[PDB]
Write an enzyme that holds these catalytic residues in place. Structure first.
Site, PDB file in Angstrom:
ATOM      1  N   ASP A  56       0.815  -1.212   0.000  1.00 22.87           N
ATOM      2  CA  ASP A  56       0.000   0.000   0.000  1.00 22.87           C
ATOM      3  C   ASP A  56       0.848   1.262   0.000  1.00 22.87           C
ATOM      4  O   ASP A  56       1.261   1.717   1.066  1.00 22.87           O
ATOM      5  CB  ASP A  56      -0.879  -0.017   1.253  1.00 22.87           C
ATOM      6  CG  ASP A  56      -1.958   1.044   1.262  1.00 22.87           C
ATOM      7  OD1 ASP A  56      -1.847   1.967   0.434  1.00 22.87           O
ATOM      8  OD2 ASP A  56      -2.894   0.956   2.087  1.00 22.87           O
ATOM      9  N   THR A  57       1.070   1.782  -1.210  1.00 28.62           N
ATOM     10  CA  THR A  57       1.892   3.005  -1.317  1.00 28.62           C
ATOM     11  C   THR A  57       1.220   4.202  -0.675  1.00 28.62           C
ATOM     12  O   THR A  57       1.883   5.216  -0.417  1.00 28.62           O
ATOM     13  CB  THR A  57       2.261   3.310  -2.771  1.00 28.62           C
ATOM     14  OG1 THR A  57       1.070   3.453  -3.571  1.00 28.62           O
ATOM     15  CG2 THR A  57       3.018   2.167  -3.414  1.00 28.62           C
ATOM     16  N   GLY A  58      -0.081   4.147  -0.407  1.00 29.90           N
ATOM     17  CA  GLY A  58      -0.765   5.253   0.197  1.00 29.90           C
ATOM     18  C   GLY A  58      -0.638   5.255   1.709  1.00 29.90           C
ATOM     19  O   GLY A  58      -1.089   6.189   2.363  1.00 29.90           O
TER      20      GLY A  58
HETATM   21  C1  LIG Z   1      -5.958   8.387   7.311  1.00 27.49           C
HETATM   22  C2  LIG Z   1      -7.189   9.130   6.803  1.00 27.49           C
HETATM   23  C3  LIG Z   1      -7.742  10.155   7.565  1.00 27.49           C
HETATM   24  C4  LIG Z   1      -8.964  10.728   7.204  1.00 27.49           C
HETATM   25  C5  LIG Z   1      -9.486  10.464   5.937  1.00 27.49           C
HETATM   26  C6  LIG Z   1      -8.803   9.587   5.079  1.00 27.49           C
HETATM   27  C7  LIG Z   1      -9.378   9.416   3.675  1.00 27.49           C
HETATM   28  C8  LIG Z   1      -7.669   8.894   5.502  1.00 27.49           C
HETATM   29  O1  LIG Z   1      -6.985   7.971   4.734  1.00 27.49           O
HETATM   30  C9  LIG Z   1      -7.590   6.704   4.480  1.00 27.49           C
HETATM   31  C10 LIG Z   1      -7.070   6.245   3.131  1.00 27.49           C
HETATM   32  O2  LIG Z   1      -6.001   6.784   2.820  1.00 27.49           O
HETATM   33  N1  LIG Z   1      -7.592   5.336   2.403  1.00 27.49           N
HETATM   34  C11 LIG Z   1      -8.946   4.923   2.655  1.00 27.49           C
HETATM   35  C12 LIG Z   1      -9.975   6.006   2.319  1.00 27.49           C
HETATM   36  C13 LIG Z   1      -9.730   6.935   1.309  1.00 27.49           C
HETATM   37  C14 LIG Z   1     -10.685   7.921   1.042  1.00 27.49           C
HETATM   38  C15 LIG Z   1     -11.878   7.976   1.765  1.00 27.49           C
HETATM   39  C16 LIG Z   1     -12.137   7.028   2.760  1.00 27.49           C
HETATM   40  C17 LIG Z   1     -11.179   6.045   3.028  1.00 27.49           C
HETATM   41  C18 LIG Z   1      -6.714   4.741   1.396  1.00 27.49           C
HETATM   42  C19 LIG Z   1      -6.250   3.342   1.825  1.00 27.49           C
HETATM   43  C20 LIG Z   1      -5.327   2.752   0.745  1.00 27.49           C
HETATM   44  N2  LIG Z   1      -4.034   3.453   0.930  1.00 27.49           N
HETATM   45  C21 LIG Z   1      -3.954   3.922   2.321  1.00 27.49           C
HETATM   46  C22 LIG Z   1      -5.265   3.487   3.014  1.00 27.49           C
HETATM   47  C23 LIG Z   1      -5.050   2.062   3.597  1.00 27.49           C
HETATM   48  N3  LIG Z   1      -6.272   1.665   4.314  1.00 27.49           N
HETATM   49  C24 LIG Z   1      -6.585   0.241   4.177  1.00 27.49           C
HETATM   50  C25 LIG Z   1      -7.417  -0.004   2.914  1.00 27.49           C
HETATM   51  C26 LIG Z   1      -7.672  -1.497   2.715  1.00 27.49           C
HETATM   52  C27 LIG Z   1      -8.768   0.741   2.961  1.00 27.49           C
HETATM   53  S1  LIG Z   1      -6.717   2.403   5.659  1.00 27.49           S
HETATM   54  O3  LIG Z   1      -7.721   1.581   6.337  1.00 27.49           O
HETATM   55  O4  LIG Z   1      -7.089   3.814   5.429  1.00 27.49           O
HETATM   56  C28 LIG Z   1      -5.449   2.542   6.921  1.00 27.49           C
HETATM   57  C29 LIG Z   1      -4.843   3.781   7.152  1.00 27.49           C
HETATM   58  C30 LIG Z   1      -3.846   3.886   8.124  1.00 27.49           C
HETATM   59  C31 LIG Z   1      -3.485   2.762   8.873  1.00 27.49           C
HETATM   60  C32 LIG Z   1      -4.112   1.535   8.653  1.00 27.49           C
HETATM   61  C33 LIG Z   1      -5.092   1.415   7.659  1.00 27.49           C
END
Ligand SMILES: Cc1cccc(C)c1OCC(=O)N(Cc1ccccc1)C[C@H]1CNC[C@@H]1CN(CC(C)C)S(=O)(=O)c1ccccc1
Ligand SMILES: [Cl-]
Ligand SMILES: [Cl-]
Lengths: 99, 99
Positions: free
Chosen positions: B25-27
């Site tokens: 997960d690069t994000g």
């Molecule tokens: C941290 C945060 C704060 C507030 C709002 C947002 C959007 C946000 O980021 C969530 C996000 O970046 N999404 C999720 C997202 C994006 C946009 C809107 C809602 C959720 C992309 C996925 C993929 N790459 C990184 C994320 C990996 N996920 C796991 C994945 C399987 C979902 S996860 O459950 O978010 C996660 C984040 C941190 C630690 C452990 C787990």
């Protein structure tokens, strides 16, 4: 290009004649953009991760140009802090993970 | 290896003598795994999530083998939707994005 992971993989994108910073996210199934006005109808959706879920608007067939590469597909618009380019568009531009 | 993104980039990892599946997960800034026991000291940590921060347990200098590549670094354990390998360890195994 080759994008390093020592920092967040942020690149410039263009949607319409608007340039924005976006994260190339291999963990995201979908593309999620910060609140913005796009024309046309949409569908409500909820997307989630650690913490929970947020409500977004699903727009179809939206063009996003990523470092000169034109991707067209589904985008979700909602209150995200970061513009996220997910796998649905990363495939279109030829993006791979390599190690 | 070269990994394309038409499916989730799920790979086998080895951690604490156990095989698990995790997402590249690069994000993600950080590596976060589902509840498990790990050796050594841990510290409470809050990490940002959807709609607010979440508590996780932070373990430092933990061995993880990702596709046959060795990493030793911080692993967070908590309520993640899926096991995620984030940039802290993706840099250790030499990962970049390419298109
Ligand atoms: C941290 C945060 C704060 C507030 C709002 C947002 C959007 C946000 O980021 C969530 C996000 O970046 N999404 C999720 C997202 C994006 C946009 C809107 C809602 C959720 C992309 C996925 C993929 N790459 C990184 C994320 C990996 N996920 C796991 C994945 C399987 C979902 S996860 O459950 O978010 C996660 C984040 C941190 C630690 C452990 C787990
Ligand atoms: Cl799409
Ligand atoms: Cl680390």
């Amino acid at each position: 290009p080759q994008i390093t992971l020592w920092q967040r993989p942020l690149v410039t994108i263009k949607i319409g004649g608007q340039l924005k910073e976006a994260l190339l996210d291999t963990g995201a199934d979908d593309t999620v953009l910060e609140e913005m006005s796009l024309p046309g109808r949409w569908k409500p959706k909820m997307i989630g991760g650690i913490g929970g879920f947020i409500k977004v608007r699903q727009y179809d067939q939206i063009l996003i140009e990523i470092c000169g590469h034109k991707a067209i597909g589904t985008v979700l618009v909602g209150p995200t802090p970061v513009n996220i380019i997910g796998r649905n568009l990363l495939t279109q531009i030829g993006c791979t993970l390599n190690f």
